[PDB]
């Protein structure tokens, strides 16, 4: 209400969060940040600044936008 994390509203702030991002994740910080997701600093776990939705266990083939949309259909950012 309205945005869950206003400090992660900036795409640059989401990108900056992806320090120590694991090589095993197979999704880039730039793809994740463009879909409104920032790094929590744990495993491959990311969160949306807008809806507060959290996503983990990324697999090769996943698209950041599609996964965000599908699991968080009320999110205004990927609507």
């Amino acid at each position: 209400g309205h945005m869950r994390n206003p400090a992660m509203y900036s795409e640059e702030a989401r990108l900056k969060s992806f320090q120590n991002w694991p090589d095993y994740a197979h999704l880039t910080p730039r793809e994740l940040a463009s879909a409104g997701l920032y790094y929590t600093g744990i495993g491959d776990q990311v969160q949306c600044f807008a809806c507060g939705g959290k996503l983990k266990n990324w697999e090769p083939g996943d698209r950041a936008w599609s996964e965000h949309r599908r699991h968080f259909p009320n999110c205004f950012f990927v609507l």
Binding site: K54, L55, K56, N57, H71
Partner: peptide, 5 residues
């Protein structure tokens, strides 16, 4: 990806 809270 898996959603969680």
């Amino acid at each position: 990806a898996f959603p969680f809270f």
